[PDB]
């Protein structure tokens, strides 16, 4: 008797089967609510939302990335109050701290989406290789560089660590972990650009120093994954998307997860979830909130994460305690690691998230490639740290 549109990006037969059943069960529990789903390929999702927004035909609820949620919120397309009500109904305390932080509004007072899944990035490492060489899990800059130096032998094409050096967003993400571990953020709480600072110069010089022990040339996603999977490096910076490869081709019990920690820990992460379109009628808004809260329950989050592409991680603390997650055979093969990965969401730090505020200005800096170019030129280009900081600072202002 009340119909709401759910625009999601699970178009594969197996994932659509799961979503049909989630919706069907929800509709049995809420017989006055009907879900009209709009399955759209993830590749095609965001630009269709652009058209729908222009024509005032947004669906009630949308599966969106956290970064696209920011763009919609800038255009005031999202009902923050409805989103916040769902999160508070579940309970803020049930979410890993970084998961709710990543979806905080620009003024830190509300939320732009209800998170359902996420992925983190850190330094994956071969546990036996480091142990054999006499190393425990590296944490601070000195330990990371110490392991990397020991495992570098250029004549043999062995390198100590695979870190991104290309002009790509991955380079910004990996560098940001070292920068933020030194309390260096590209923006301050007021939105001022803070690139050319002493703490950022320290991190950029260190990233340059560390790149002496990574593969020569330009390293991006393919170079890093290849080097880790074939044993060229014992350490590699990569999202949790590396884990399906380890399961299929490696030893899930021989992989550890190290987090850069100098002045503080900095886990890079992102989150996806459900947002609620602004301007919904009363009964439609109440039905959407119920639907989002339904999918946000731990037992349905577990299903969502388990059907999501490999390496997807839960953002609610209770998912790792759900039976279907605990007893999943892929999860099982990784031992204690999945609990450790999930818990790393408590230490998320990303450029532009400052004091529980996600500043939308950061999206433009990332889009323009300023940080990636700065990292690319100091590493691959052998450029000067000081000059590249100044150039990046000036360009980030001109936007």
Automatic annotation (TrEMBL):
Q: Which InterPro entries does the record cross-reference, listed alphabetically?
A: Bact_solute-bd_prot1, SBP
- Highest taxon, organism lineage: Bacteria
This protein's UniProt keywords: Signal, Transport
| Xref: SUPFAM superfamilies | Periplasmic binding protein-like II
Keyword Transport on this protein? yes
Family of this protein: Belongs to the bacterial solute-binding protein 1 family.
Q: Which organism is it from?
A: Listeria monocytogenes
Q: What is this protein called?
A: Extracellular solute-binding protein
Under the heading Pfam families, the entry gives: SBP_bac_8 (PF13416)
